[PDB]
Swiss-Prot record, chain B:
Ranges of residues in domain Peptidase S7: 1-156
Catalytic residue positions: 36, 60, 120
Membrane topology reported for the UniProt record: Peripheral membrane protein
Description of post-translational modifications: Acetylated by host KAT5. Acetylation modulates NS3 RNA-binding and unwinding activities and plays an important positive role for viral replication.
Whole-protein residues included: 1514 to 1669 of 3419
Function: Displays three enzymatic activities: serine protease, NTPase and RNA helicase. NS3 serine protease, in association with NS2B, performs its autocleavage and cleaves the polyprotein at dibasic sites in the cytoplasm: C-prM, NS2A-NS2B, NS2B-NS3, NS3-NS4A, NS4A-2K and NS4B-NS5. NS3 RNA helicase binds RNA and unwinds dsRNA in the 3' to 5' direction. Leads to translation arrest when expressed ex vivo. Disrupts host centrosome organization in a CEP63-dependent manner to degrade host TBK1 and inhibits innate immune response. Inhibits the integrated stress response (ISR) in the infected cell.
Subcellular location(s) of the protein: Host cytoplasm; Host endoplasmic reticulum membrane
Self-association and partners: Forms a heterodimer with NS2B. Interacts with NS4B. Interacts with unphosphorylated RNA-directed RNA polymerase NS5; this interaction stimulates RNA-directed RNA polymerase NS5 guanylyltransferase activity. Interacts with non-structural protein 2A. Interacts with host SHFL; this interaction promotes NS3 degradation via a lysosome-dependent pathway. Interacts with host CEP63; this interaction disorganizes the centrosome and inhibits host innate immune response.
Protein name as it appears in the record: Serine protease NS3
Organism: Zika virus
């Protein structure tokens, strides 16, 4: 049996750590909800 | 039991110790998570029980106690915040500018942050704090890193 535990509030945080890039990828989605690259 | 709004960890005791299998959002008495986190199984919230109400394997989403309530969309131009809740680690907001998943049926937002699979279901937010989607379903790029889609459901 799976159970849930509170982890916090859902709020926007000013001065948060800004990281990560913005890539444009050609993807395909199959019937099993799985993505792949084209 | 507990139905206060907020982000929650999805745990299991079926393996060794307590293992975090995913994350979800509680909003308007409905728990929202990714399908692959629970497989549609019932969840426990203290003494209470949450039963699945809606789910779809292709969208990779599932709601508990009621229909999907999250309907905010990425505006296609602004930075977002992945509120990551990693296994054994404290919840933390990461600001990023999403990329794009180009598909045969249109484009989807994509956050390029790599976290352990147990972080699946973590909410992605707009400047207003609204949940624009969940993190945890995407693809593995040439580098090895994960790029997840901004997955949003439909509010009836
Ligand atoms: O595997 C992951 N997600 C997932 C799993 C199973 C299924 C789906 C998505 C949709 N169909 C069923 C995953 C999630 C995160 Br967050 C980080 C990852 N790093 C990886 O290498 N894989 C993942």
């Amino acid at each position: 049996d799976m159970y849930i535990e509170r982890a916090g509030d859902i709020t926007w945080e000013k001065d948060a750590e800004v990281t990560g890039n913005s890539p444009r990828l050609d993807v395909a989605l199959d019937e099993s909800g799985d993505f792949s690259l084209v | 039991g507990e139905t206060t709004d907020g982000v929650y960890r999805v745990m299991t005791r079926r393996l060794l110790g307590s293992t975090q299998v995913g994350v979800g959002v509680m909003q308007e008495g409905v728990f929202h998570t990714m399908w692959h986190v629970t497989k549609g199984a019932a969840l426990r919230s203290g003494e209470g029980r949450l039963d699945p109400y809606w789910g779809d394997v292709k969208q990779d989403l599932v709601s508990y106690c009621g229909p999907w309530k999250l309907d905010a969309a990425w505006d296609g131009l602004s930075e977002v915040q992945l509120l990551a809740v990693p296994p054994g680690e404290r919840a933390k907001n990461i600001q990023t500018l999403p990329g794009i998943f180009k598909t045969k049926d249109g484009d989807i937002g994509a956050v390029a942050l790599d976290y352990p699979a147990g972080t699946s279901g973590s909410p992605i937010l707009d400047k207003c704090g609204r949940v624009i989607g969940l993190y945890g379903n995407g693809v593995v790029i040439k580098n090895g890193s994960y790029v997840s889609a901004i997955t949003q459901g439909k509010r009836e």
